[PDB]
């Protein structure tokens, strides 16, 4: 009990940066309760730069070992559509991850207050899929794809974030089985805790497409647990606003929201899909952001 705490803390120490970041970070401004703790922005004293700091209490996780994943897996990851992690530290009983601050905030604010058009939807889906093709080719599953995990720059550039539940697969351990995600976005094979791969993020992306069209995921008013039962048991959920979606968006969505995971399109395939040729540039997103509306 105390023994498992102390061991866990020593283990994490081997993968985090040594040192106390409190000596260099000032002006903490809370922006969220995120997945697994609080997210603040702060100023780096030596550079004047703003960063985002996620702080996760070691004693408050459902599965403490998941805290190993992001801090190891995302360590020196560079991709234009993925939130960059700068360092991590152990501060008392908290893990702090310091990362790039996305001043445009999250896609959730948009999707609940406005209606994206298909140009904008394709731009988001292209960005996310560029991120997921590269991630998935090196064994990394995100496992919490939803609008809250998509962040924006001031000029409409899109980046994937919230890697806290991400997982690494490999040749010798190619599948995971953990019930991890956000209930309404979870793939049905993951709900059933069957072995699963990168395919799970493709299904969640489908649900996020439903968010972008309808405003919310299917069965959102149902309590989480029954909603999960429905997803597991029913046929693919349908858009409420289907009459407003183009034939190419419908055909795109049909390749995402497939139950049989071996039939579901991969990110690399979806990158070639004609829906994505409608993608707008970063500027097309900017009108939707809270500050411009």
């Amino acid at each position: 009990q105390r023994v498992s705490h102390e061991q866990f803390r020593a283990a994490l120490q081997l993968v985090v940066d040594p040192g106390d970041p409190r000596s260099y970070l000032d002006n903490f401004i809370k922006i969220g309760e995120g997945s697994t703790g609080i997210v603040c922005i702060a100023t780096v004293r030596s550079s004047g730069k703003l960063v985002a700091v996620k702080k996760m209490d070691l004693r408050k996780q459902q599965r403490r070992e998941l805290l190993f994943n992001e801090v190891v897996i995302m360590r020196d990851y560079q991709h234009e559509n993925v939130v960059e992690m700068y360092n991590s530290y152990l501060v008392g009983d908290e893990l702090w991850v310091v990362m790039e601050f996305l001043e445009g905030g999250a896609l959730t604010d948009i999707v609940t207050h406005t209606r994206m058009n298909e140009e904008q939807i394709a731009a988001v889906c292209l960005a996310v899929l560029q991120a997921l093709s590269v991630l998935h080719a090196q064994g990394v599953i995100h496992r919490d794809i939803k609008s809250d995990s998509i962040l924006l720059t001031h000029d409409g550039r899109v980046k994937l974030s919230d890697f806290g539940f991400c997982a690494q697969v490999s040749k010798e351990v190619p599948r995971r089985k953990s019930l991890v995600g956000t209930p309404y976005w979870m793939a049905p094979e993951l709900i059933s805790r069957l072995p699963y791969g990168p395919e799970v993020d493709i299904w969640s992306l489908g649900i996020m497409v439903i968010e972008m069209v309808d405003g919310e995921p299917p069965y959102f008013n149902e309590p989480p647990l029954k909603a999960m039962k429905m997803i597991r048991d029913n046929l693919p959920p349908r858009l409420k606003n289907l009459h407003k979606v183009s034939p190419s968006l419908k055909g795109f969505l049909d390749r995402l929201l497939v139950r049989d995971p071996a039939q579901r399109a991969t990110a690399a395939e979806l990158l070639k899909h004609p829906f994505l040729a409608k993608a707008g540039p970063p500027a097309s997103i900017v009108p939707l952001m809270r500050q411009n509306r």
């Binding site: 599965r63 953990s178 995600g181």
Partner: peptide, 13 residues
């Protein structure tokens, strides 16, 4: 209903 919060099953606790 309408919850945006993640769920992690503590299956090994």
């Amino acid at each position: 209903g309408r919850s945006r919060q993640p769920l992690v099953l503590g299956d090994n606790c």
